[PDB]
Symmetry: none
Subunit: 131 residues, 2 copies
């Protein structure tokens, strides 16, 4: 049984999507989304309230932001997740790439990527589950 729902997005993202569909010969927009959903479904991945799960969060952000760093800290503290180690490299005047080694439970860790990614100043956020 097939269902449909509509997706909202900006012109910029739609342009990039349509360009790729033409370029790679995707049959439709739905097809690309289906394939990615399937991909996420079958993708390598890691259970209880095991509080010993390890993960790595990768974050690219504008390090000029006066309060961004404190906000990330507060989000980790609120989540009850432990930061074992962090590394910041400045890639250019604007951008810092940070790797964050995390430890906590599965539920909490899986919600960090979106929280951090939504902070203003943050340009990229991607979590990796160590398993």
């Amino acid at each position: 049984s097939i269902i449909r729902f509509s997706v909202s997005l900006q012109q910029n993202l739609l342009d990039e999507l349509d360009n790729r569909i033409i370029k790679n010969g995707y049959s439709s927009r739905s097809e690309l989304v289906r394939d990615m959903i399937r991909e996420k479904l079958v993708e390598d991945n890691w259970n209880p309230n095991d509080e010993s799960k390890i993960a790595v969060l990768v974050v690219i952000y504008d390090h000029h932001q006066r309060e961004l760093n404190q906000r990330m800290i507060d989000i980790f503290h609120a989540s009850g997740t432990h930061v074992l180690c962090t590394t910041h490299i400045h890639m250019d005047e604007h951008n810092c790439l940070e790797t964050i080694i995390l430890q906590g439970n599965s539920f909490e860790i899986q919600r960090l990527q979106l929280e951090i990614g939504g902070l203003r100043g943050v340009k990229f956020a991607k979590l990796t589950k160590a398993s």
Copy 2:
């Protein structure tokens, strides 16, 4: 300033979408789909064989046993043979038999993925995953 297109899905795919929304704390199907589209576009972008585009940034995450004989040197050999530029690496000691390492790389997609492939296929390497920026 917003556009909507329809997506047609088998129920089981929609279920996977909906399950992930709740798991990761997405606010809607639209937000998650946008995220997926972005991630997919990056993949396809990296899937292009652009030898001359050496501007790509990635982080390789590796868990390995530092006790494995010659593994360290073997990994060193691989990086020296690699055309990628290592910007920074951090090694953290987890326990006796587990070291976690994050490797920040720059180069073209061919070299970066060849590196991932070669490291991941090593004895003593438990885990190897690449983040495409």
